[PDB]
Point group: C2
Chain length 291, copies 2
């Protein structure tokens, strides 16, 4: 893992890293913010700094959310690290949308393990995020926990990947906390999701659809999914349709445990995301035992 | 004044405006964030929401600082509005750097009233910021004060314009508060400043140089200039040289009232700026009588 660039921000440091990925077979870019706690003189030996993984939306790189969501202030506030993965494999060797669009191909992996050629070669974003990356960060830094006491969140395509990873890992307690911002919640039933699934996967889709996954996953204790979405989000009725997760949990053990806050006047933008980052941070902090 | 685009952010609203400018003779773009106080049901008739004007650096538009500094949270915290002007006149009719560079011409007005053709035609950024814009916002919105109880701040070229406006307006109490982030402080003695001055102005420079202005301006009461600058700022030794303002006030009524916080490890970037926005906000809030 190479340090490409470091920025002091708040009391910690935002680090731009790269590494040769075994899942993607390409160089991958990742950012991590390390909180003030990591640089502090007295950090207790019987504590670990837990990690939040923030998954970005379509066309994004790690830098968009790093610059525009202000997680760094929350990170110092509660004592967690936050990791910002990229959104697809990238490179001259990596397949693109044959239609030359932005909703598929590069910047648009949909957090899936692709089975269809030519994408299967590089598009192993599910193993990348849940299997390789935490271990890679662990080998490089190890104060920090990338593997155990970990939260997952993200925006749009990323809230989708977040919810999806949380649910598929739920019996193993893979993630201790799950939130999302304007997620795509039922990919199988929405145009954007169907193109990603047809393209990357070619019945294989069910394993990647939160609305189908959640129904037979036995809810435990007080666990819940925090969602925010703006009612002025221009993608809301065609792509996101959050109401669909609500409907999916009716008469199900998850029924009272998916909280969608639909927030009047708000967008899809990082103006929206930055506004709800404080609440999501405190939600993740409590689930991580920081407060 | 036209509303081009509105975004809910925090409890207020970020508004992208445009207007036909009489100072520049061109369309100008401006952003303003209005705090939660402005939309609130009970806002007292014997109060006005005071305004912070944030001046941006070279190549910037209003949107950079709007997206990347998170003033909006401070604005709701203390009860001020924040205005983000543009950095030059813009348009197909507006003169550029004959050298095709970014440090002069468009995005690079240096908050000056240009006297030299072809720039004089549009480059009236000093009257634009201090004379036209506050009155224009006043006519459009009038809860709000754009004219009287007003603070000025900004980054690099903008901290320069901020300091410069504050000092030239100081006997008239034009601005009630002045801070800056990584300002250029002695334009007459630094390469970037000399090119702007030679280009826009052609003795005419003194009137626009904070290090020359401050020495005979009689300091009153407890007033002070707040500056932050990072010691890893790559422009620090060639262009910014903050130490120069310090030297300028030695044996002067301003001597103990220019506070430069040189902050270890920090950049020129909005990672730096966003880190010190909370402190600057509380400093401006107190000078504005909000706290």
């Amino acid at each position: 893992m190479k340090v490409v660039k470091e920025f002091s921000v708040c009391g910690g440091r935002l680090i731009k890293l790269s590494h040769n990925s075994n899942s993607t077979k390409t160089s991958m870019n990742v950012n991590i913010y390390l909180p003030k706690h990591y640089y502090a003189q007295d950090f207790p030996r019987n504590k670990r700094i837990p990690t939040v993984f923030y998954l970005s939306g379509l066309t994004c790189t790690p830098d968009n959310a790093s610059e525009k969501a202000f997680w760094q202030f929350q990170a110092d506030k509660y004592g967690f690290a936050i990791v910002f993965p990229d959104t697809s494999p990238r490179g001259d060797e990596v397949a693109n949308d044959p239609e030359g669009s932005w909703d598929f191909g590069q910047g648009a992996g949909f957090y899936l393990n692709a089975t269809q050629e030519p994408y299967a070669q590089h598009y192993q974003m599910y193993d990348y995020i849940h299997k390789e990356l935490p271990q890679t960060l662990d080998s490089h830094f190890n104060k920090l926990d990338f593997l155990d006491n970990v939260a997952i969140t993200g925006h749009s395509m990323g809230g989708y990947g977040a919810i999806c990873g949380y649910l598929k890992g739920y019996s193993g307690k893979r993630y201790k906390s799950c939130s999302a911002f304007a997620p795509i919640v039922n990919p199988s039933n929405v145009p954007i999701g169907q193109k990603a699934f047809k393209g990357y996967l070619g019945a294989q889709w069910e394993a990647y659809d939160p609305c189908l996954l959640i129904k037979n996953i036995r809810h435990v204790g007080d666990d819940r999914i925090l969602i925010h979405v703006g009612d002025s989000d221009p993608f809301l009725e065609e792509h996101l349709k959050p109401e669909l997760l609500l409907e999916a949990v009716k008469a199900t053990s998850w029924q009272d445990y998916v909280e969608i806050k639909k927030v009047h006047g708000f967008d899809h933008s990082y103006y929206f995301v930055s506004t709800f980052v404080p609440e999501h941070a405190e939600f993740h902090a409590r689930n991580l035992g920081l407060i």
